[PDB]
Design a protein around this ligand. Structure first.
Ligand SMILES: Nc1ncnc2c1ncn2[C@@H]1O[C@H](COP(=O)(O)O)[C@@H](O)[C@H]1O
Length: 241
């Protein structure tokens, strides 16, 4: 899937990194196999690791939440590496926000209404669907020409994501992940998109809770807006083993 986000000015800041052991880092999303493979291919190609992990200390545990860096972490593990350069964030600062992504596609709601129904889901026509989704009462609202409620919670969200990640890689839909619901609705009006999937965004406390339960969200659940991007770093891959 293709990210499609606004032009946020987020400043680069020169924040030093520290090496943290990979087995002390906890993911909060399922991995995308394509992203993992691409990182492995890139890092082995140059032998430079230039983009630190962004981490948050798990309260009460000798562990860190991966805020940004799931595929770097997993890819380094698969290569046999032991650590990664990391920037530790003040995650519960008001300066850090968490939003979600809005999976939107161009296509027909037929190979998708039925192919979600094959994974085991319901799709009830409901004018209040988006309203219910945003209060966190259903798994997804599905909005385009009509409005549909997809009942459930996390297990159901993972099924909706699953279908789409497969069909994207398969190439029967064009899957864009919108940073903003309203941008999807613009591109929808223009005809470039047909439907959008709307769930309530997780809170920071929920992300931390999920991690402490040893659980993960589906891909593209969190969209963290951070007060800075760390400047690039000069770490050799050989330093990570
Ligand atoms: N040589 C490299 N060192 C560090 N990060 C990289 C390298 N090549 C690609 N990346 C990043 O690896 C990330 C893999 O996804 P994630 O770790 O989930 O953000 C992407 O954000 C890429 O920008």
């Amino acid at each position: 899937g293709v990210e499609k986000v606004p032009k946020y000015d987020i400043p680069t800041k020169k924040v030093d990194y520290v090496f943290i052991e990979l087995d002390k880092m906890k993911p909060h999303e399922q991995l995308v196999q394509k992203e993992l493979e691409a990182f492995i291919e890139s890092v082995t190609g140059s032998g430079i690791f230039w983009k630190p992990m962004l981490l948050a200390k798990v309260p009460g545990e000798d562990m860190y939440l991966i805020v940004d860096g799931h595929h770097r972490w997993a890819g380094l593990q698969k290569l046999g590496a032991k650590r990664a350069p990391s920037v530790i964030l003040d995650y519960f600062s008001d300066d850090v926000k968490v939003y979600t992504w809005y999976p939107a596609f161009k296509g027909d709601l037929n190979e998708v209404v039925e192919r979600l129904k094959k994974e085991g889901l319901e799709v009830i026509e409901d004018p209040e669907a988006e309203e219910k989704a945003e209060r966190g009462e259903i798994a997804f609202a599905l909005v385009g020409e009509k409005s549909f409620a997809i009942p459930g919670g996390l297990e159901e969200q993972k099924k909706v994501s699953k279908v789409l990640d497969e069909m994207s890689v398969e190439g029967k839909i064009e899957l864009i992940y919108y940073g903003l619901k309203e941008d999807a609705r613009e591109d929808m009006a223009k005809g470039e998109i047909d439907y959008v999937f709307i769930r309530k965004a997780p809170t920071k406390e929920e992300v931390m809770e999920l991690v402490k339960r040893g659980e993960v969200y589906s891909p593209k659940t969190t969209r963290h807006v951070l007060p800075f991007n760390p400047d690039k770093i000069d770490v050799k891959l050989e330093e990570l083993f």
